[PDB]
Amino acid sequence: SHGLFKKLGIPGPTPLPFLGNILSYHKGFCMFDMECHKKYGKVWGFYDGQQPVLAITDPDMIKTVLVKECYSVFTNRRPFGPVGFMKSAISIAEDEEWKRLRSLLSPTFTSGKLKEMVPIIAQYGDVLVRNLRREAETGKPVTLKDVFGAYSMDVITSTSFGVNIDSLNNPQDPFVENTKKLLRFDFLDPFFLSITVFPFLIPILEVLNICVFPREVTNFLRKSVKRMKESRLEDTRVDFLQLMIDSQNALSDLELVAQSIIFIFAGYETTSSVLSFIMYELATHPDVQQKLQEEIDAVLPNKAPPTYDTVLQMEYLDMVVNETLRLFPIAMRLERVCKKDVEINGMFIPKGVVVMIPSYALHRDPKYWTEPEKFLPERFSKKNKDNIDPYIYTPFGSGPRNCIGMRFALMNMKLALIRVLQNFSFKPCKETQIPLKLSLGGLLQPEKPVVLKVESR
Ligand SMILES: CC(C)c1nc(CN(C)C(=O)N[C@H](C(=O)N[C@@H](Cc2ccccc2)C[C@H](O)[C@H](Cc2ccccc2)NC(=O)OCc2cncs2)C(C)C)cs1
Ligand code: HEM
């Protein structure tokens, strides 16, 4: 296996027996991707254990695997460990299975359904400002992840299940406590390092009922979803939950739970993380924060409530969101398994190979971005906008397998940002880590929580 890239004429770091190039992930795989792009150029290959991983950076080639040949050859993501029943979760499912889950869940975020959620989200936006104002009162340092996380949990559960768990008023909320423990992918943990280097273990762990997701956490989610499912079949809004309930009358019970777990995690974890990164960038760039507040005041004079339409009018807010996602992409890498031998744009790719798009590296690539390490919202303005390649910058992925919650995530975060900024200003304090350093974990997260001071306007 370790002689594949050598044989095909593809550059790459020399692999070690059994480990492949996995030890290079000691200072984060993003740095590894950066160094490989600089050292080897437009394409290179490395090995995760025995698994060949081909990294591509050419726009047209990226478009070919993410869009053109999605259903035909690059249909699924890389298997990543024992998943138990979560094998049915849409993001983990493959081929035809994934195809039906996709069409089934697709109606969830139509433009019409998104608009209906605005007032629902607003209730939580109001509680968010209230909680933050308390922090502004005491003047104590604020851990963004907690407050923004509770807001995110409340929003995803209400809009998806029509149930208000009121996380914004219950700090030890079991939903957040459990969800934040759902997946702690860490290469320093022997379990995750082992299954990544030796995939043959996966089948064995599945028999043993050993899962990457803690049994205690999934049990909790399973019970929680059942409860909410009941409250709906017993009471006298077509939402995520309804869509799945309707299918049952070919979706099985655990299967419905599997999708629910994906939505809860994405709505809570992924959303609150990006909000934290955005507020960090705003606190360390007062001119950007000041300028953003002015746009909001101009569009919504005297703290007027935001609306679906006015959210879309805010050009700078959108430039700020996009720029933060460029520097801190939750998708540090995008991947597709090559499920059959094929050539694309002049390059041959053997079956079984994992094709990887080093997003984090491409976003900081000194060919497409001047001053790549700088937070400059202007690069996304109408003027410079069209000069950004649609396949170099894909924070939500692209093609048939892209983020199904993209429009909801952008709308929800923007609603939060608006309410918060039309009431407060965030400033860095003593507990604020600057520069901000990312953890080496599998998911996009800073090493120490982002802490900031909130001041009332
Ligand atoms: C060595 C290798 C295995 C590793 N790769 C990475 C980066 N890459 C490329 C990944 O595909 N990492 C994977 C991942 O994020 N997979 C994903 C889609 C994706 C791809 C790239 C960037 C962001 C989202 C999806 C995985 O099926 C998971 C599994 C899961 C279920 C419940 C709670 C947490 C996780 N599904 C979700 O996390 O959906 C949540 C979300 C929805 N939108 C953004 S995240 C895994 C490790 C789970 C980190 S470690
Ligand atoms: C700012 C927040 C978010 C970001 C940055 C984001 C980003 C991504 C990315 C990069 C992928 C991988 C796509 C690919 O491989 O091409 C993904 C997949 C997915 N996301 Fe998100 N996401 C976010 C929020 C959400 C939310 C809130 C939901 C749902 C409510 C959601 C549901 C999904 C699903 C189900 C998938 C898998 C799609 C499939 O396999 O068909 N995401 N997301």
Swiss-Prot record:
Effect on the protein upon substituting residue 406 to T: In allele CYP3A4*3
Catalysed reactions, semicolon-separated: an organic molecule + reduced [NADPH--hemoprotein reductase] + O2 = an alcohol + oxidized [NADPH--hemoprotein reductase] + H2O + H(+); 17beta-estradiol + reduced [NADPH--hemoprotein reductase] + O2 = 2-hydroxy-17beta-estradiol + oxidized [NADPH--hemoprotein reductase] + H2O + H(+); 17beta-estradiol + reduced [NADPH--hemoprotein reductase] + O2 = 4-hydroxy-17beta-estradiol + oxidized [NADPH--hemoprotein reductase] + H2O + H(+); 17beta-estradiol + reduced [NADPH--hemoprotein reductase] + O2 = 16alpha,17beta-estriol + oxidized [NADPH--hemoprotein reductase] + H2O + H(+)
Gene3D superfamilies assigned to the protein according to its UniProt record, in alphabetical order: Cytochrome P450
Documented effect of changing residue 377 to L: In allele CYP3A4*13; lack of expression
UniProt modification remark: Polyubiquitinated in the presence of AMFR and UBE2G1 and also STUB1/CHIP and UBE2D1 (in vitro).
Biological process per Gene Ontology, one example term: aflatoxin metabolic process
Tissue specificity as recorded in UniProt: Expressed in prostate and liver. According to some authors, it is not expressed in brain. According to others, weak levels of expression are measured in some brain locations. Also expressed in epithelium of the small intestine and large intestine, bile duct, nasal mucosa, kidney, adrenal cortex, epithelium of the gastric mucosa with intestinal metaplasia, gallbladder, intercalated ducts of the pancreas, chief cells of the parathyroid and the corpus luteum of the ovary (at protein level).
InterPro entries listed in its UniProt record: Cyt_P450, Cyt_P450_CS, Cyt_P450_E_CYP3A, Cyt_P450_E_grp-II, Cyt_P450_sf, Cytochrome_P450_3A
Result after altering residue 161 to S: In allele CYP3A4*17; exhibits lower turnover numbers for testosterone and chlorpyrifos
Residue numbers binding heme: 403
Record annotation: effect of changing residue 90 to V: In allele CYP3A4*4; significant decrease in catalytic efficiency
Pfam family, one: p450
Outcome reported for the amino acid change (mutating residue 190 to R): In allele CYP3A4*5
Entry's Gene Ontology molecular function annotations: 1,8-cineole 2-exo-monooxygenase activity; 1-alpha,25-dihydroxyvitamin D3 23-hydroxylase activity; anandamide 11,12 epoxidase activity; anandamide 14,15 epoxidase activity; anandamide 8,9 epoxidase activity; caffeine oxidase activity; enzyme binding; estrogen 16-alpha-hydroxylase activity
Induction conditions: By drugs, such as rifampicin.
UniProt superkingdom: Eukaryota
The EC number(s) this enzyme carries: 1.14.14.1, 1.14.14.56, 1.14.14.73, 1.14.14.55
Pathway as given in its UniProt record: Steroid hormone biosynthesis; Cofactor metabolism; retinol metabolism; Steroid metabolism; cholesterol metabolism; Lipid metabolism; fatty acid metabolism
Self-association state and partner proteins as the record states: Interacts with PGRMC1; the interaction requires PGRMC1 homodimerization.
Name of the protein in question: Cytochrome P450 3A4
Organism: Homo sapiens
